[PDB]
């Protein structure tokens, strides 16, 4: 998606070198910059759309979905590992219960 | 159809002696209060549809019909 492309045939898509000031070029540049920023934000959402790289509010939503609650002053890297470990919790056997003491130490 | 004005019914299958389903269909329709006809399915092209709706002579129902 490019604002310069597919806009119109007759519209002047380049600034006039005859005069420094050009409201048309300024408007086109501002619109293109806004739409390019929107495109970059949309592309940047790929990391936020996956649990392996979700951060900030998205990771909190993932934790709420999985039921694992964020601890105070907890960073994303440790929080994701804690979520993964809790989802694969090993408990029920005497050795596993004893091995679970590491989380209660 | 007019659910509010119509009470519970006990329409029998054999109301017409050795009659067709169309004859029994007419009794259920209770014309002219309800219109029944076969027409092409505009919403789903490629197949037919059976229509059984209240008569369009009502003001709001008249507006509901698509205009051509």
């Amino acid at each position: 998606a490019n604002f310069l492309k597919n806009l119109h045939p007759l519209l002047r898509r380049d600034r006039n070198k005859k005069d420094n000031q050009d409201p048309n070029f300024a408007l086109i540049d501002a619109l293109n910059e806004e739409m390019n920023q929107v495109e970059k934000d949309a592309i940047e959402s790929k990391l936020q759309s996956s649990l392996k790289t979700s951060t900030s509010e998205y990771l909190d939503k993932f934790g709420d979905w999985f039921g694992v609650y964020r601890k105070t002053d907890e960073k994303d890297d440790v929080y994701r590992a804690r979520i993964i470990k809790y989802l694969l919790l090993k408990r029920g056997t005497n050795n596993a219960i004893i091995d679970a003491i590491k989380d209660y130490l | 159809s007019w659910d509010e004005f119509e009470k519970l019914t006990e329409v029998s299958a054999f109301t017409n002696f050795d009659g067709s389903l169309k004859q029994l269909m007419d009794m259920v329709t209770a014309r002219p209060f309800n219109e029944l006809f076969f027409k092409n399915s505009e919403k789903t092209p490629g197949k037919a549809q059976l229509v059984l709706r209240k008569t369009p002579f009502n003001p709001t129902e008249w507006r509901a019909l698509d205009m051509i």
Partner: protein, 348 residues
């Protein structure tokens, strides 16, 4: 990717536009450029909002797809009815499944049908059978004594009535309910645990309330539907489907339910001295009945929770609420369930 209001985006775009020239700085409401920029910013804000909503929906869909824990669809309403004969029965009659039941009341035209056959014993006078509502949703929760006729010949039947209301009829589960169910499922992966047995018994869609009581060498399971009446077929289905979560070395039993009764008396001081008639009292009593009947075996009656439930009405109308009898929280036994009995409500 973060939410941004329209005004900030519009200001940023206007600031960017002003670079390189000074023949544009006029943004009154009558200006068309301002209108175009407002429309563009509105579209961008709507795009951001829809993107966030679709991201949340995609997260939900991925959670659905990964563990195959699909959301529960609309749940059929069902209950029990009583068949009354003119005279005591002489011969063993037959009642095939699918027999229709209809309510003569115009306000509740929804139909009901049976699924399992029933046989009337000889020298009988009455029999109880189960009926399942064809429609699914709120329409199935008819009041008491709504079903009047069988909608058939009824040669040997005088009248039909139901002594209990229908509560199993419910709409589709909300997002919060699915989130809680998924959290229970995630915490239930470790078998031989009470939280795991909770999900194991709750996996059947019909079950709503469920509780597990443990002792030194025996495990007991208490469960019931929204109406609060366990069935043998439900117990058999639970036993069949729970084999993948039962403890290996400990016996399990699924039985036990009792309706605990309590009378609730409350005093309400409405802010408006006018309009203190019995209609609002009846409405409040119905609301209290709906709240109390919604509780389950795991839940316990709490004074503050009841206060919050009744005070859902706007605080401007109801200014103060107090209980003459209830002064301390009541602990429900594990087998029993607390529910409304005979409720009396008065102004003062």
């Amino acid at each position: 990717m973060k939410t941004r209001k329209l005004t900030n985006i519009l200001s940023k775009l206007i600031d960017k536009t002003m670079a390189g020239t000074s023949k544009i700085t006029d943004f009154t409401p009558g200006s068309a450029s301002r209108s175009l920029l407002e429309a563009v910013s509105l579209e961008i804000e709507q795009f951001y909002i829809l993107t966030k909503e679709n991201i949340d929906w995609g997260i939900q869909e991925g959670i659905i797809e990964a563990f195959d824990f699909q959301k529960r669809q609309s749940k059929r309403a069902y209950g029990d009815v009583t068949i009354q004969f003119y005279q005591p029965l002489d011969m063993r009659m037959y009642i095939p499944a699918g027999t229709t039941f209809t309510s003569t009341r115009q306000e509740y035209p929804q139909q009901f049908e049976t699924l399992v056959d029933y046989y009337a014993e000889p020298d009988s006078t009455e029999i109880v059978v189960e009926v399942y509502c064809k429609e699914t949703g709120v329409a199935g929760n008819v009041p008491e004594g709504t079903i009047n006729t069988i909608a058939s010949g009824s040669s040997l039947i005088r009248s039909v009535n139901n002594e209990y209301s229908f509560n199993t009829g419910t709409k589709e589960e909300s997002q919060e309910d699915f989130k809680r169910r998924f959290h229970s499922f995630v915490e239930s992966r470790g078998r031989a645990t009470n939280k795991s047995v909770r999900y194991g018994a709750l996996q059947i869609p019909d079950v709503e309330g469920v509780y597990v009581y443990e002792e030194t060498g025996h495990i007991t399971v208490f469960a019931h539907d929204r109406n609060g009446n366990l069935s043998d077929t439900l117990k058999e289905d639970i036993i069949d489907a729970l084999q993948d979560y039962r403890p290996s070395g400990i016996m399990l039993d699924v039985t036990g339910v009792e309706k605990e009764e309590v009378n609730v008396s409350a005093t309400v001081t409405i802010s408006n001295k006018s309009r203190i008639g019995d209609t609002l009292q009846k409405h409040i009593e119905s609301v209290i009945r709906s709240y109390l009947n919604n509780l389950k075996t795991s839940d316990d009656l709490i004074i503050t929770d009841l206060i919050q439930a009744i005070m859902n009405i706007d605080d401007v109308l109801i200014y103060d609420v107090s209980f003459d009898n209830l002064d301390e929280n009541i602990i429900v036994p594990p087998q029993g369930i607390i529910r409304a009995g005979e409720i009396k409500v008065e102004l003062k």
